[PDB]
């Protein structure tokens, strides 16, 4: 018969980082394998349509990355804008909304994220080219700005249909109802909630700035792609048993009937290298597709709505979420309600008043030692136990641990005070 | 035709010197040659009007076949992300 | 074979922590500090979660407890009796064992060389022909290794998907109550209990 | 105008089994391909950084 | 949209008017007081 009831709370903002896309690459085998050699190209024709398979696989990956970005970010029908007056009931969204001053209309956090992660193809070029993404960073920033404006000005209604305006304190009161806390808790503690949220956003900025390994996932994706390409280019210097790794030396030194043998050795080596590279790219692209599907689900369920899934949209009872763009990824700021300062109480399943058992409608019976109250479970707010607060079912002889206490019916008291006397 | 990852000046100098390898030539009117980050686009008239993306080229630029200035030609354009909507937020 | 970073004792300790938390505090330890609650009250609130009033549990508390205990006994009997109960984990182990067996057995292949034993090649022949035979063998063994690594990468992707699903199940079924149909068992989800198993 | 209402219930405990990890393996190619042979190792160097 | 008269059955009370930001004065119609009045205000 012991229960710990929260008496305070904390608005905790956490960060999740999800890769969405990967560098798009295109590879011409005829240059990589046999660069600027007709002879080696004729020898390469004998290996069949391996090049068609490699080209198709890389093109599929390239289209898939644009598809990933489109699925994660282009979930909004209309580019929404915040009002000219940036007042939202004391909530300061200046660090997540676009900064109009700078040449790029990105929030300060987006600028930090983009700075942290790091037409001449100077490096790695042996037929390897990098195709640009279909959506520039400005377009992704515009989509993210639309998402912030929509969620700030209309809550979940823009996700579920037309964007219906609502004052932000009312939106947060309804999210409070969503987690299981009454609206008066927010409205009575509005200033505290706003201050906690603003401090949390400041701590998010400080945490992203300070920790070098904050954005390790996106940098890991970039590093893996850079490695893969470096290894692919470096395999050209290998001989694979041939007299030389330079095709021009082979063609300059030897007649055809032995240059063909050496060039066939080299072709086998380079084809093996390309097949390995394409296979690793396909596997990593599958991984990034899984990550992008997760990011799209997070955008749908955390940003465009409120999620009852535990730990899906941050640690704690999910209140709301804010997306931010990052190079080849998305960063969700998960705003959650964390109970705090729990207090010790005695509890009972039901209250025996007149031989009838009384159960809470929405709450739990608690006791401060001397008196019994009904309180909502996620915040301590003791109330007098009344027939309006409880419902009756059965008698006192069935429930285990039932405790005798008075249940105050209002109507009987009122009728007594009203016309007991009549004269 | 998009020549990927090359400046339009280099492609033009290659065409005039007959160095460029694909022997076919897309006729250049002087207004249908456009520079994108994806490469040099020859044969499409860039327009300031923004439309929903139809044929993605890259770097925010798409292209589509549209009835422009009365005859139909391939135009290139920066894609529109969507219609704007200013929510009537108030206290 | 490299050992896992968490021994079976550490996984058992984590699972014990999860059981103690969910038994003594319900969903509150998942969502923040662990707030104690009597277990009948916790199950009454889960009953409210599925759409059944608290008095249904409190009036039928003994029946619910007896049904739960009988169900756990049937779980023990079902796991003990059925040989194919744990087929997934055994399948993972069998696939890894196969892959390694095939990788080792590819060494006995010649791939066109005069012998599969490198020492025989080096003992019999001079360099300029032992090199040819050893290059044939190198090509064969490199192909075998590439195939093995590719299968391991694909299977590792599959196991990563399975582990992500398991983590989501731990988050939503154990640390809370899920309204997702058939996600946390068949029927209206009341609660869940994790147990460790080899590689799962 | 017909509805079936439950009058009793059953507390059903079911089992789900999910793999989480797989045996970790490490492979030295220089032993597998060319075990204890310098000559084969020099030949293997020509294949690059596989 | 389904407008209803604001009543004590429709709302719940917590705190006083000096705390909530943007509170608006308006009548909340309790049914029981009105009924008791109509019922036996006079007695004769
Ligand atoms: C619930 O917790 C919140 C904090 O999460 C409590 O509000 C905090 O109250 C303390 C003590 O009154 C404040 O500290 C004081 O703040 C000012 C700062 O200028 C200064 O005068 C003092 O030096 C002292 O540090 C603290 O600022 C305040 N926090 C916020 C965000 O307002 C609140 O009282 C708790 N409620 C209950 C019922 O326990
Ligand atoms: C929302 O919070 C942000 C902080 O995240 C507030 O930004 C504040 O902006 C000013 C510049 O506009 C920052 O610098 C200050 O400027 C003047 C220069 O004359 C001076 O008074 C100070 O010495 C300071 O340098 C200021 O540091 C920054 N605030 C913080 C905490 O860093 C913004 O004002 C907030 N918006 C609302 C509506 O509260
Ligand atoms: C709802 O279903 C439960 C069972 O799921 C019913 O409880 C069961 O009632 C039967 C008949 O009374 C019990 O069988 C008897 O049990 C004892 C065992 O020692 C024995 O005296 C008899 O030989 C007979 O087998 C059964 O044990 C009991 N089950 C449990 C778990 O308590 C319950 O009556 C049903 N309620 C309604 C309203 O239909
Ligand atoms: C338990 O709560 C009750 C009600 O809040 C406390 O009793 C009240 O104490 C205040 C003290 O200022 C008095 O003004 C009220 O008149 C009391 N009300 C009643 C109904 O007695 C009680 O003291 C609390 N007990 C403990 C141990 O916390
Ligand atoms: C709640 O009050 C009832 C009486 O209203 C208690 O029931 C009595 O319990 C005593 C125990 O010695 C019996 O001798 C009486 O015959 C009972 N009377 C009735 C009318 O049932 C009950 O025990 C009280 N419960 C608690 C927890 O205090
Ligand atoms: C709601 O009505 C109350 C009175 O019932 C108003 O409170 C008065 O406000 C005036 C403002 O000039 C003061 O001079 C009075 O002393 C206040 N009286 C009391 C009893 O508080 C209140 O301002 C009204 N609120 C709104 C929004 O109209
Ligand atoms: C609550 O009170 C009991 C004694 O009534 C005590 O044993 C227990 O430790 C208290 N709870 C906490 C969290 O301290
Ligand atoms: C193409 O070259 C010109 C100078 O010849 C340069 O100004 C321009 O920036 C180049 N185009 C791109 C896309 O860099
Ligand atoms: C909301 O009220 C505040 C009060 O300080 C005011 O500054 C702000 O302009 C108001 N918002 C709108 C949209 O009128």
Residue numbers in the entry:
A (entry chain C): 710 to 827, 849 to 1153
B (entry chain A): 610 to 679, 689 to 709
C (entry chain B): 860 to 1059
D (entry chain B): 710 to 759
E (entry chain A): 1110 to 1153
Sentences from the paper on this structure:
The JN.1-sublineage KP.3.1.1 recently emerged as the globally prevalent SARS-CoV-2 variant, demonstrating increased infectivity and antibody escape. We investigate how mutations and a deletion in the KP.3.1.1 spike protein (S) affect hACE2 binding and antibody escape. The spike proteins exhibited three conformational states: “one RBD up,” “all RBD down,” and “flexible” (i.e., one or two RBDs disordered in the density maps due to flexibility).
KP.3.1.1 contains only one additional change compared to KP.3, a deletion in the NTD (S31Δ). Compared to the JN.1 spike protein, KP.3 carries two mutations in the RBD (F456L and Q493E) and one mutation in the S2 domain (V1104L). Previous studies have suggested that the S31 deletion and potential N30 glycosylation may alter the local spike conformation and enable the RBD to adopt a more “down” conformation, potentially enabling escape from certain classes of pre-existing neutralizing antibodies. S (S31) and KP.3.1.1 S (S31Δ) in both “one RBD up” and “all RBD down” states revealed similar overall conformations and no change in intra-domain distances (Cα RMSD = 1.1 Å and 0.9 Å, respectively), indicating that S31Δ and N30 glycosylation did not induce any substantial conformational changes. CryoSPARC 3D variability analysis demonstrated that all spike proteins had similar proportions of up and down RBDs, suggesting that S31Δ does not influence the conformational dynamics of the spike protein. The S31 deletion and N30 glycosylation exhibited a minimal effect on the spike protein conformation and did not affect spike binding to hACE2 or to the broadly neutralizing antibody BD55-1205.19 However, addition of N-glycans at N30 knocked out the binding of the NTD antibody C1717 and altered the glycoforms at a spatially adjacent N-glycosylation site at residue N61. Structural alignment of SARS-CoV-2 WT, JN.1, and JN.1.11 spike proteins with KP.3.1.1 showed that the NTD and RBD exhibited greater rootmean-square deviations (RMSDs) than S2. V1104L has little effect on any conformational changes; V1104 and L1104 are both surrounded by a conserved hydrophobic pocket formed by P1090, F1095, I1115, and T1120 in the same protomer.
